[PDB]
Curated annotation (Swiss-Prot), chain B:
Protein name: Major capsid protein
Gene (name only): MCP
Compartment list: Virion; Host nucleus
Upper classification of the organism: Viruses, Duplodnaviria, Heunggongvirae, Peploviricota, Herviviricetes
Function per UniProt: Self-assembles to form an icosahedral capsid with a T=16 symmetry, about 200 nm in diameter, and consisting of 150 hexons and 12 pentons (total of 162 capsomers). Hexons form the edges and faces of the capsid and are each composed of six MCP molecules. In contrast, one penton is found at each of the 12 vertices. Eleven of the pentons are MCP pentamers, while the last vertex is occupied by the portal complex.
Superkingdom of origin organism: Viruses
Amino acid sequence: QAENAARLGRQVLGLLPPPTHRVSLTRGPEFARGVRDLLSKYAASTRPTVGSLHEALRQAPFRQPTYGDFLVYSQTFSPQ
Amino acid sequence: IAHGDGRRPNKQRQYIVMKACNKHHIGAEIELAAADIELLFAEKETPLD
């Protein structure tokens, strides 16, 4: 039954806002390796494949709308 | 080639030719549907998935 709970370990930790880019200075120039979505020109080959570009598709923009929750009389809003 | 008539003599000549390359550009657009990009990352669930 925890396998169902292990699903929520995957999906909730997979679906988050991206955290703030904060690296301590004592680590060095590792922070330039932590910038991937600003890179927008991926290399191509003679026969490119998904395994060559599965990293390329992984960066995607951050799009999440804001919903509205309305409680309506069933007479005004027609049911279909 | 010189000859024995009354024509003027011929000095040696020299020619210089200027040639250059031409640029060309090629490009095509691929579309990929958003669900196709997304469920390449979605987890394996069932033998229908």
